[PDB]
Design a protein around this ligand. Structure first.
Ligand SMILES: CCn1ncc(-c2nc3c(N4CCC(n5c(=O)[nH]c6ncccc65)CC4)ncnc3n2C)c1C
Length: 822
């Protein structure tokens, strides 16, 4: 029971709980206890919520960002069903009323006491929303399906809730002693060091002497820095970089001069260093957990008495506009001088002010903190900038979190990826971000679900394993029922990896149709049939992966042999037919980030009243170079369509005609003008999106098109011009945009109009894209590793330029892409 839950949580996080105890770090012991209570309390509150409020936790409504329609409905106990005529603008209650009246006429004798469960899905229909706003109904429109719903009474819903229950006086120049080592290299060895607050240095870099290349060296040098003990900030960081010289980095190590309880770090410290794959302030402040092979640096932090960092109470007592839109020294002085009026008249310039203050001056810092305490709540966009590595202070961070509490579950969900990456900056295990995320995660099952997998995937990384395992453990104490749902997924993912290795070996000896049959034999085995069937999709907790259709399952013949897994459900009909791509051996983190952005562009466009028919399909990294991808049904690649396949409905003489012929065959009659509008809008957005993000290697094999006419791109392994990518236009698309005519300038200017509208809309939001890409420098993706990668986004959107200049410059780029297009 208790051991079962503990051994289940270890099974789930992929790390033994005992490994946390064996450290004997009281910070860790303190984190597990504080959080467990926090998380446990959230579950207690959650058990007293009303059935409709419970549905908002467990079944978050999936909405869309005069005409009637057919709809099927039924009840829980009985299996008989009925159909109705209802408006797109009608409410769930209106639908539930006719459903109640039809049962009241068949049964022969209160809509507010029912909820419409989508059959064979983890979705419900309720609230003050017109039937059109629901994704499941909006889906039934384009597919022409019959919505099948179950009338679940308030009593039955509460039965599910029940069954799912669980100081300044020290004015000496700061110094430390450098004792001995235990490393390998061959020359002479040196040890640089330095103090930091964020990216900036608190003083100068003090190197040691050139001891010869050969040992477990001994220096025993008192390294005295160019800064006083009184001038050290609460979040002072001390780096170390060991290297050889006659140029060669060997290892790096960082640590906080203060502890988590605010006390200055005393005496003797052994630092287990990480390799290099010169000085790295961004890197984690905890030591390498591979104690055996990891080299080290033993040092002494001199004592000075039990000294603690001053409490708040103590600190509390201690041509202007022209430049406020980096800066000079005479300007830095002006900004700092005027600091009072920046609070009063320019509160949203806080981030700019914090950068001009001297963090190596406890007076400037006390006066800065003093102002910051009485600063007003900034916007969510401004708060995201305050979570940058440049703002390490806790008071700043705690205030940034204060301003992100207003995020909706959907706005939180949009930024969640970046919020998990900021935890990699965090100096102390317990923090407000962790407190926030975890609290929000326990308030919404979809946020908890998605946060979980964001943590769970990076467990194989040593720098975060401890941090993330602890947060996940906490979540499982708070979400005991969801933990089981998540295990079923883990077991499925566990099998998928085993099955995929088989398929990878098999393909090297045998052939594809044999491997395919061999693979299906493995799937039919007892453990695989139970493990891969019946589970909520990791890509979408509302989709249910029920019966795995083994005959339809396969893999693509491409290096990593990605598995193609297909599902079906009797209870859902066609809505229960869903496919997933399991990938292993490649990192999908970049693909998820490229997709997150495309989806954000669709939101910012949709918010300005512009729907460019984008297809931001699910992609979820779940483990070590492991993840799932969502199969977008009723779609095929341009290469598979351009084949110009023999005796198909799209037989064409030339390549240009292949595309449009495919659309005529999938959208006959009046349906084709809708499909070309769909194609034009989606193409505009994907032309703009791939241009802004710089997505190269765009061949017909990785560009797709839906049977509805919507264009979409796949395989986002290379972004930000890291194969300077130009704007791209293919003649085969221009031809379709032009309704299959060599000259339809009428349509072409509408198209060019969408590319111009879209492009400018994103420039107005250029800072959001920059603010979110700035927090991803924590993640460590090969192509999001420096300011030069952020410079691509600044340049592509042209933020330094005005609207007039950027649009004029973009029209030339658009024309240039049109000239190169044959
Ligand atoms: C990063 C990888 N990635 N990202 C998105 C995707 C991806 N591929 C597809 C797809 N495909 C592309 C591959 C096609 N295909 C083929 O031409 N030969 C095949 N053999 C076996 C299976 C599939 C085959 C079938 C249609 N159809 C629908 N959605 C998709 N998504 C999200 C992919 C594959």
């Amino acid at each position: 029971v208790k051991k079962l839950i503990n051994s289940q949580i270890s099974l789930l996080i992929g790390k033994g709980l005992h490994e946390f105890d064996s450290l004997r770090d009281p910070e860790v012991n303190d984190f597990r206890t504080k959080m467990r209570q926090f998380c446990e309390e959230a579950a207690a509150h959650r058990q007293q919520l009303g059935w409709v409020e419970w549905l908002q936790y467990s079944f978050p409504l999936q909405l869309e960002p005069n005409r009637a329609l057919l709809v099927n409905v039924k009840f829980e106990g009985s299996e008989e069903s009925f159909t109705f005529q209802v408006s797109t603008k009608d409410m769930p209650l209106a639908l539930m009323a006719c459903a109640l009246r039809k049962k009241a006429t068949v049964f022969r004798q209160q809509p507010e006491e029912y909820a419409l469960q989508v059959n064979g899905r983890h979705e419900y229909l309720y609230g003050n929303y017109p039937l059109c706003h629901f994704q499941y109904i909006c889906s039934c429109l384009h597919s022409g399906l019959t919505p099948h719903l179950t009338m679940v009474h308030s009593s039955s819903i509460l039965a599910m809730r029940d069954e799912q229950s669980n100081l300044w006086s020290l004015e000496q120049p700061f110094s430390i002693e450098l004792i001995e080592g235990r490393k390998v290299n061959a020359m002479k060895l040196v040890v640089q060091a330095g103090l930091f607050h964020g990216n900036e240095m608190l003083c100068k870099t003090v190197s040691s002497s050139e001891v010869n290349v050969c040992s477990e060296p001994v220096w025993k040098q008192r390294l005295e820095f160019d800064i006083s003990v009184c001038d050290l900030p609460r979040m002072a960081r001390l780096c170390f970089a060991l290297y050889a010289v006659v140029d060669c980095p060997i290892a790096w190590a960082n640590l906080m001069l203060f502890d988590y309880k605010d006390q200055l770090k005393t005496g003797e410290r052994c630092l287990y260093m990480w390799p290099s794959v010169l000085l790295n302030p961004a890197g984690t402040v905890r030591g390498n957990p591979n104690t055996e092979s990891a080299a080290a640096l033993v040092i002494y932090l001199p004592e000075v008495a039990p000294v603690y960092f001053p409490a708040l109470e103590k600190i509390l007592e201690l041509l202007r506009e022209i430049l406020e839109r980096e800066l000079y020294e005479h300007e830095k002085d002006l900004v700092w001088k005027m600091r009072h009026e920046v609070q009063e008249h320019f509160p949203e310039a806080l981030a700019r002010l914090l950068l001009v203050t001297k963090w190596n001056k406890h007076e400037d810092v006390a006066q800065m903190l003093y102002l910051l305490c009485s600063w007003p709540e900034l916007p969510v966009l401004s708060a995201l900038e305050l979570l940058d590595f440049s703002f390490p202070d806790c008071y700043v961070g705690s205030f940034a979190i204060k301003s992100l509490r207003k995020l909706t579950d959907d706005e939180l969900f949009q930024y969640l990826l970046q919020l998990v990456q900021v935890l990699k900056y965090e100096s102390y295990l317990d923090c407000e971000l962790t407190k926030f995320l975890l609290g929000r995660a326990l308030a919404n099952r979809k946020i908890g679900h998605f946060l979980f997998w964001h943590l769970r995937s990076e467990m194989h990384v040593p720098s975060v394993a401890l941090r993330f395992g602890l947060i996940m453990e906490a979540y499982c104490r708070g979400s005991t029922h969801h933990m089981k749902v998540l295990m079923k997924q883990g077991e499925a993912l566990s099998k998928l990896k085993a099955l995929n290795d088989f398929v990878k070996v098999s393909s090297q000896k045998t052939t594809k149709p044999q491997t395919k049959e061999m693979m299906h034999m493995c799937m039919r085995q007892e453990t695989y049939m139970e493990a891969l069937s019946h589970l909520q999709s990791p890509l979408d907790p509302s989709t249910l992966l029920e019966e795995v259709c083994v005959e339809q399952c396969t893999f693509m013949d491409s290096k990593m042999k990605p598995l193609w897994i297909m599902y079906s459900s009797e209870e859902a009909g066609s809505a229960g037919n869903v496919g997933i791509i399991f990938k292993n051996g490649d990192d999908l983190r970049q693909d998820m980030l490229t997709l997150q952005m495309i989806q954000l562009m669709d939101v910012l466009w949709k918010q300005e009243g512009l729907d460019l028919r984008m297809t931001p399909y699910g992609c979820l990294p779940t483990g070590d170079r492991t993840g799932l991808i969502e199969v977008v049904l009723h779609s095929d690649t341009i290469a598979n369509i351009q084949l110009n396949k023999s005796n198909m409905a799209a037989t064409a003489a030339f390549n240009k005609d292949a595309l449009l012929n495919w659309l005529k065959s999938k959208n006959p009659g009046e349906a084709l003008d809708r499909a070309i509008e769909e194609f034009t809008l989606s193409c505009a957005g994907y032309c703009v999106a791939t241009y802004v993000l710089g997505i190269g290697d765009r061949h017909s094999d990785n560009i797709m098109i839906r049977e509805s006419g919507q264009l979409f791109h796949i395989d986002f392994g290379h972004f930000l011009g890291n194969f300077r990518v130009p704007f791209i236009l293919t003649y085969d698309f221009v031809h379709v945009i032009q309704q299959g005519k060599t000259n339809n300038s009428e349509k072409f200017e509408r198209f060019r109009g969408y590319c111009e509208r879209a492009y400018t809309i994103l420039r107005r939001h250029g800072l959001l894209f920059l603010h979110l890409f700035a927090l991803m420098r924590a993640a460590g993706l090969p192509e999001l590793s420096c300011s030069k990668d952020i410079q691509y986004l600044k340049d592509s959107l042209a933020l330094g330029k005005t609207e007039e200049e950027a649009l004029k410059h973009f029209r030339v780029k658009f024309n240039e892409a049109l000239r190169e297009s044959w």
